[PDB]
């Protein structure tokens, strides 16, 4: 759920990395003509998972950058607002709620129904309504 330091070598597309405070969803990664030494810089482009912001950044091969860890889990949705969805975990009675577009996958933006049990990511503090259980 927190964070931690990856080399920049190990990073793959569709893992994830953190620029900015912001845990993104690595897209592109390129790397330059290795120099006399084997030594490369590596440019990655990576989407925040809430921001939606593509973000780019350049770093050596060999370096290490910050990379979110993310807990799937489950809760039900027990309040819609015109502007947010809050979610319950039933047992722990724990609650989160996020703005609908911010918070909320794309895909699911105007399926959500109260009452209905979602995956929800959780990493750095934050949320995301991923899918719906059962599909639907």
């Known amino acids: 759920g927190d964070k931690t330091k990856v080399q920049v070598s190990k990073l793959k597309p569709g893992r994830y990395i953190i ?13 330059s003509s290795p120099g006399k030494h084997g030594s490369a810089k590596a440019r990655i482009e990576a989407v925040g998972i809430f921001d939606g912001k593509v973000r780019s950044i350049v770093k050596p091969t060999s ?21 947010t969805v809050q979610i319950m975990d039933m047992e722990t009675y724990e609650t989160f709620e996020v703005p609908i577009d911010t918070g909320v ?13 979602v995956e929800y990511w959780e990493t750095l503090g934050r949320i995301k309504i991923m899918r719906i259980k059962g599909e639907g």
């Open 19 to 31: 620029i900015d405070d912001e845990p993104c969803r690595i897209v592109n990664i390129t790397v």
């Open 63 to 83: 370096a290490e950058v910050d990379v979110p860890i993310i807990d799937k889990k489950t809760a039900q949705v027990i309040a819609i607002t015109p502007d």
């Open 105 to 117: 996958a794309d895909e699911i933006r105007d399926q959500l129904k109260e009452g209905i049990n």
